[PDB]
Design a protein around this nucleic acid. Structure first.
Ligand code: NA
Ligand code: NA
Length: 327
DNA sequence: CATTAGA
DNA sequence: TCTAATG
């Protein structure tokens, strides 16, 4: 957790490099398994050799470790930290819509900057257009103050359109959290579940609503069960307009909401820990259901849920207010 | 680990 | 269709 601090960090920088700049899924995949294990290691690594005895630690990394342990740095790490090319890809990538592949391509055309981007806005697709457009706001955190307002909006429509809707703003927001990255709306409706052959309109219907009123301002992607867009709060009595905010609405078959919802609300740790428990308690949890574990090895059969409670019960835990779904 | 775009 | 990107 700290005794292995730098080692793990160098390792991740490294891993990251292969992954992004180079197309080195393997090397990259190496660095991380390595960073995973040294992290677990209970002791202060004193040398490559020592490290080396570990699984995943080949000679390649050991070597790296000594140098860093030796001198407060690593050259390669230094060389890469310097390089404009690689530097360039690390940057472009921030653009929502821009991945590594695209990053490299742009770079090799000479697109390195933001401006560069604008000059060749033509070479960009919609998503990437909007990513570039809202570059600034997309980087900014959402205050809970704002969150509440937004939420309030979405909840109001959803209902106005159909009363039978059920929306849940998941995430950290849902976990109390003072700020949030974007907003997630868990959507479900009774007339939609596991089997009931869809109702795409069920999604569409509301998307449309949000837009009609101008909450939704852009679409990154709209498909039958997953919308990806941009939204924004009505800039009051002027002098202050709102930043454009990332947003994701998604249709869920009523018979899987609470799992979905439990799940999405995290925290990543709570899940696992919650997940790990259902296992002893003879279960199996995942993004959509909970199933009784059968001796033979495995076993199925989707236990029925009407609240985040039911699920708890099943595994006989204490209902944890999301506030405390912290870990 | 899945759903959407894209070309 | 593959492949890329976000979640
Ligand atoms: Na080894
Ligand atoms: Na990006």
């Amino acid at each position: 957790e700290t005794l292995n601090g730098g080692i793990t960090d160098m390792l991740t920088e490294l891993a990251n490099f292969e992954k992004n700049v180079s197309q080195a899924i393997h090397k990259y995949n190496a660095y991380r398994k390595a960073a995973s294990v040294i992290a677990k290691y209970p002791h202060k690594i004193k040398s490559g050799a020592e490290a080396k005895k570990l699984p995943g630690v080949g000679t390649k990394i050991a070597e790296k470790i000594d140098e860093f342990l030796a001198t407060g740095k690593l050259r390669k790490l230094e060389k890469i930290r310097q390089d404009d090319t690689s530097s360039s890809i690390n940057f472009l990538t921030r653009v929502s819509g821009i991945g590594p592949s695209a990053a490299r391509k742009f770079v090799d055309e000479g697109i390195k900057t933001l401006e560069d981007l604008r000059k060749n806005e033509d070479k960009l697709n919609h998503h990437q257009r909007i990513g570039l457009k809202y570059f600034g706001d997309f980087e900014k955190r959402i205050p809970r103050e704002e969150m509440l307002q937004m939420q309030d909006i979405v909840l109001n429509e959803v209902k106005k359109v159909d009363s039978e809707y059920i929306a849940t703003v998941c995430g950290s927001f849902r976990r109390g959290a003072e700020s949030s990255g974007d907003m997630d709306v868990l959507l479900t409706h009774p007339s939609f579940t596991s089997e009931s052959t869809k109702q795409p309109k069920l999604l569409h219907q509301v998307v449309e609503q949000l837009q009609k009123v101008h909450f939704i301002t852009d679409t990154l992607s709209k498909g039958e069960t997953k919308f990806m867009g941009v939204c924004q709060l009505p800039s009051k009595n002027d002098e202050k307009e709102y930043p454009h905010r990332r947003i994701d609405i998604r249709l869920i078959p009523k018979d899987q909401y609470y799992c979905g919802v439990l799940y999405f609300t995290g925290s990543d740790i709570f899940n696992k820990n919650m997940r790990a428990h259902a296992l002893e308690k003879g279960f199996t949890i995942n993004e959509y259901t909970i199933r009784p574990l059968g001796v033979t090895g495995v076993a199925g059969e989707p236990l029925p849920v009407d609240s985040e409670k039911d699920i708890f019960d099943y595994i006989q835990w204490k209902y944890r207010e999301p506030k405390d779904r912290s870990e």
